[PDB]
Input
Amino acid sequence: DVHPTHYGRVCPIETPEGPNIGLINSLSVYAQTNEYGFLETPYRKVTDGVVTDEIHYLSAIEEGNYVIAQANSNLDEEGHFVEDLVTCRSKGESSLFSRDQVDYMDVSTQQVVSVGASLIPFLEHDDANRALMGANMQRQAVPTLRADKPLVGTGMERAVAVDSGVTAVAKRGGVVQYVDASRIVIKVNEDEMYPGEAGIDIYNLTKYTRSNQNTCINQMPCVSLGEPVERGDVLADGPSTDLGELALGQNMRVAFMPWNGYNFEDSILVSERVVQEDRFTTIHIQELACVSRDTKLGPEEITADIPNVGEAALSKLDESGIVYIGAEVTGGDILVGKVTPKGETQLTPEEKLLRAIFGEKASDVKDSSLRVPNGVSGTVIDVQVFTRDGVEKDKRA
Amino acid sequence: DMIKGKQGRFRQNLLGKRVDYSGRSVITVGPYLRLHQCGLPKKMALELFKPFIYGKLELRGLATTIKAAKKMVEREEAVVWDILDEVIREHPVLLNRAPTLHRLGIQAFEPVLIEGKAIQLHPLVCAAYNADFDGDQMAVHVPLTLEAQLEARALMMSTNNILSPANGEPIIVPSQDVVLGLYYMTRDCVNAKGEGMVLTGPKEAERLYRSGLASLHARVKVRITEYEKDANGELVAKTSLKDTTVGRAILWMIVPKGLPYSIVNQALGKKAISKMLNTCYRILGLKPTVIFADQIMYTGFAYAARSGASVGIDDMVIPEKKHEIISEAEAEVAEIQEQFQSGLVTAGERYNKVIDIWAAANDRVSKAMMDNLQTETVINRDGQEEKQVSFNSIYMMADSGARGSAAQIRQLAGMRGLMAKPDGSIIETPITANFREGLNVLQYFISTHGARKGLADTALKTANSGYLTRRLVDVAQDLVVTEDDCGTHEGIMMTPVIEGGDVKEPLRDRVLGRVTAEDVLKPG
Amino acid sequence: ARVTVQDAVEKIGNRFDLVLVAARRARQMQVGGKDPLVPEENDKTTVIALREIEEGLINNQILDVRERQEQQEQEA
Amino acid sequence: YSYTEKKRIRKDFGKRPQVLDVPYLLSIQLDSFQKFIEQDPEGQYGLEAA
Amino acid sequence: TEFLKPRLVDIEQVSSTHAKVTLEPLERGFGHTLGNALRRILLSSMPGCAVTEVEIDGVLHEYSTKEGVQEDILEILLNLKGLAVRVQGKDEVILTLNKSGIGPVTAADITHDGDVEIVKPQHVICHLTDENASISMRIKVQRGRGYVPASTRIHSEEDERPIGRLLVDACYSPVERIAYNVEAARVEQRTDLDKLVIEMETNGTIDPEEAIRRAATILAEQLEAFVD
Amino acid sequence: EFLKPRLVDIEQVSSTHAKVTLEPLERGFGHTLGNALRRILLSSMPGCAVTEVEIDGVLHEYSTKEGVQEDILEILLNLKGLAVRVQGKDEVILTLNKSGIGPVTAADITHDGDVEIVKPQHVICHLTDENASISMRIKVQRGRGYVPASTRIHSEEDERPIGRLLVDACYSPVERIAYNVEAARVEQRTDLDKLVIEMETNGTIDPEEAIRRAATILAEQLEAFVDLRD
Amino acid sequence: DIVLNPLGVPSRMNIGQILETHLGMAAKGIGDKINAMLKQQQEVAKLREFIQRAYDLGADVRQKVDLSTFSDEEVMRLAENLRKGMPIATPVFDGAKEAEIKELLKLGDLPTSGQIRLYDGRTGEQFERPVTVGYMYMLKLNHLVDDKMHARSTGSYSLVTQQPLGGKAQFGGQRFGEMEVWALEAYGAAYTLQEMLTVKSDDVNGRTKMYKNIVDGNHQMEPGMPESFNVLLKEIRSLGINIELEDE
RNA sequence: CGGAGAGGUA
Output
């Protein structure tokens, strides 16, 4: 359960719903660690009746001694409360205190949520539990075919997009000398140029690389030729990001009415138009790692000639036994022509009789090819070959 | 040690008894399936009945071997669709929820082959399954021998299992959507198009409403012919003129013969529809009951759709005097706390005083909100304004018992207010903000404590309930009714439980379903 | 087609030995030994046996005399 | 202001001026690892202390 | 392209009233569109013959019993709605229900005009007991479309008949039950097809199949000028 | 007794948007005919759409060409919105070849005499290099409704050519259909209504021919109901 | 695009999604107006003034307006990116009031209640009351239905405990846990327990012969001698303990 | 693949 000292240090409303709710918190937006290791929250210092823009990072125990006004205090002039009586918190409990007795102010109205929870709009209208499911489902969103900004947002989308590394941010300002689907080349401004000639700045963009959740991540160059850029702006939108704004899902037209019972509990009815627009359409990337092994019967070889297979399976492969990049395959088709040298030619008479009767090929090498697992399909987009020294570099390598 | 591992004899309990001829998939709602049907994806069926399909294919001569059957099914030719329709003509399937906490947790259905990739569960059964539609996945099994199939049909199917095996009473009650549709359609108004005329049975009620000439709601005299069970089981057709509403007659079309009209009048709530289904079961039987349930589901959904009952933000109503009552509450607590600093009240004293003040304020706010709801719509008859059941969608939304309660719609428009703090004690200052209005940062922070506490409580109670079910099953499982009568005139005194002045439960409820141990006499 | 078991419940009040006897009836018209006594609607043998027992055509006495019959022919 | 900003301004309804912008949201990891791997002229966290 | 036409319509009739007309297959979205257009045609506007104005032996009343019959005016008003009358001549014709003596006053007691047929042989409309055992109703049977309340006509006519001549609602539509359902069908790979099944019940003047087919003819002729 | 609805002025708000009105419509036919026509139009109208795309340089959907500012995926997603019509034959192969910098638009496509680009400012992609040149072959064919990426591959048993790009073909020429029933005044009788249909289409079908097609399909459907075969 | 059950709102308390719907309706209405003017090719001054009005909406809100941006090109691109609605930034506990949302609805020329009367495209009759329609930001969670379907009749077989397990080319069966056995037990369900434990779960010979019987065209199973029973019988017998098969 | 340890979901 949440102690009343988690205010502005960890998010009270974001935590997994499994057997470890409350054990796994998320850091607040403004929270940070002190040199010792205890957490602190920024707070505006209130001089006597003036709330200075100066910030002090009050510690967990430091918050206890002091009295802190709520982030919803209304301030005019140079930082004076419009209220002689202001909501405050001294030990974790609320109170109403004199405007000239407060010690500190919350720097922001949003300084008590995680980044996951901060994005939810109208958070002040949901159930705490329900908004907790909402925050936990924020994370589980998958990047759609296009990034679509949320028409109703919180304004932290830009901060999250920039701070996370999925966004190619312009390191040094300049004018974009070159834009392409893979590279961005910035002719850096001379005032930011270094002694000698550091010349241009090149941002190579990750394009269709498997994330750890098998979700495709790629970066779209949002800028165009000759567009001036300054330090700290977006050169290319990452996955689930549009114009430097975090774009988790997509905006749908919605009508709230129990249309012919197809919305019974929380079930949602979708228009065929959504499928037409290919929105909410997701790319997913699998990895099928085929490793050649060194065995006691012979070191395994990656070859394009596989026994006991037809020409159709071989027709998607190159001469090196690896499928073409860009071929449409389905569960069962051969990707990598792995064969294990069958150094053991002696077998039971049953096996020999079966292979003779069934008409299967008999060789001193056994098939080991990695076929597409049944249930997955798609198009091959990457082939990576890892070859340690001492092994010949084949054509694909 | 090989005698016993965990949890015992390995092959009769955990671990882990995974079984073939079964599947698992997320569930969607199909409001067109009849109560004995479940919508099952075509691929799921095709891979659940491959042996039966092979048998049929080689039976028709369409395949000469298992290899030909494999090719024939994998090529997805149009012929296998007829084969699968044949093997699924009436072959039922068993759906079980991932946790089965009561007997109904597994039930049979007739599978209807559907497009998609989710199991279309009957909407009215999901309440019995104690499931929802949130990504939770149901599991299908196929009782695949004849005798298992008949065990499924006679016992497993939801048609034969409609009452809870815990207290009797139907478990197949309309829950949230169809009940909203019925509550809307059976409501009355004080003035609408089509008011006052006389119509030849519900025939003309349907004809006139579906013309859009007469509103669904109108004080209308209709000559209805209702059937009553009398004598040794005969039906008497009593025809009389009844003061009803057009929608109520249209609904009366649903109810089969042999039921009174005392059920399909009045605004139908969830308890009212519970009563209707219970009476139908206890008066006609099961077949009229199942047909009535399916038809009333269809009609409730259809007229919920035609209603367009929608939830916005102007529908939820903020009482005009809520802030006034609040400000009175702060004035009172200010006086009390001034006495506290005056040393006039002890800590517990003013604590309880403030708690009572805020409870009274919450009660007043809820009363004002509900008073605003109950007659939010006022309509003239021929010049004078009249109250009547509010057209307000949020009022039907919970008054029908669709979803929510007076507490929940009380905490949306009015304050959810007082709640517990860490150490489980009530906060001095309630959550004075609604959800239609905003929540202050500290208010939401405080509210989060309760939600976290509830979620932890939920997880722990799920685990402990599983354990308790286990121990009780272990202690009770070796107990089977095996004799019809032992002649034991011994019994128990069995009385209506009454605490204080209030009778908590009626002896009428208890006595039902028991057998007397003596011959009861009259009280005189 | 009839998938509800109320008539079979009324005919056989136990409605549980009902399952066993209907299952046997289904078992031996599914495999040779007897043939359906009710017109087939492309139905599985389960429901044709159920419709047989609904009509009062199949009852415990009738089924047991019928089965003892097929034995005294199969020894003969 | 920002060039990316001026491309699509997302309208705000905030009514309290935001003193102190949102800090770098990975400051915890960067702070930890820089404290761990930097040089220390004294006994302070990192390889120097070890 | 190619279009899928829904051949092989099946029909199931109960008496000459209760028709279940099943048809398969209709393609996606066409089933319910056809159903709704048909029901609107059948309900809202079809030619028919119904009673418009009636004669009360005394003053017109809606809240008093019949003068000399222990049955109410409302119940005869309701019975005459269900009267199955088919006018083969000019539209607005007088019908005389003059029956004396005790017994159940039914359709047969009304005179026959020779162009006004009563396909309903027995339809109870009154019950005469010995108070005077005589009833004399002068009613108008007229042709119209759909359904017409009496209020609409009485407001539309500046001339009012003398008290005793009371305007009665007209059930012009020969079909009294109209309902339609669309259930999932299946043809080969596609399982998005839908069967359309329509349940209709007539007053008995015309066969339900004839009513629905002439309604379809009406709509097709409505579309005669828009088809190549 | 029943009059017959007649075509009256079919105004053109734009190429995409048009109003078609039917003046002499009897009582109880306004909303009925409106729903009829709207359902027919949104449900079943012939339309020309892109199905197969063959970009010279790239090997698959997710492989991005050098020189362009857009992924091949986004190029396909723009190709979906290509407003094209063919009326001389059912299936045609458009060809596009453009080099140099600038926005490659639909107008640059090498059009035949039987193919019309009713939206000749449709930005296909952006070429951002002088050396880079884009070479497209786009298959445009007639169809109805929506054909998601799962079916024509069964008409060929896998795409034997590699580098072929498969696109969800949305043949629906219309995107908005709305009907309004308004009290029409004419000397004949007293109660008749204008049926005014707003139709936003992709500019590839004439409103007159569209309504005619819808009516013909509806008449073919009502053929069975006029004459019940049993 | 989307129809949502209005039952989930008044019970699960998340009326925030309704406010999101209304505000998104207003935003997409502003987007529709700006898109219309783009198609109308209105003067750049018209776009500037309308956008300034839209951003100026609300009291005490600090967002600052043009003209500080470039006169034409930046304004043109801003409108072009805004033709699909105004992205609205709402601080979580410092956000928009209902009055401001309604003001945006007026500026969008759309109903002040966020409610406009639909017509059911199925029937084509307006619903008896107006309903709530807007724009909602929806997230496709990673729980995809393709990732959740798995079904089998045959396939992978394990050792020690004979039951379908492992692999994703054909994933194993469902854990027929003791709770399911108990649910069968509470019912008179007896046989289905026998198949789900004996003949289609563990015994390989029984599974093979029973699959053969089904392929033969008949749903066949014979109780006979339960194989697990025989195994446990021999197992106890090896303990020098004889198990008698006495019948009651 | 037999059973334990860990994250995530429901």
Summary: Residues 22 and 41 of chain D are 32 Å apart (CA to CA). The beta strands of chain D are 11-12. Helices of chain D lie at 3-7, 27-37.
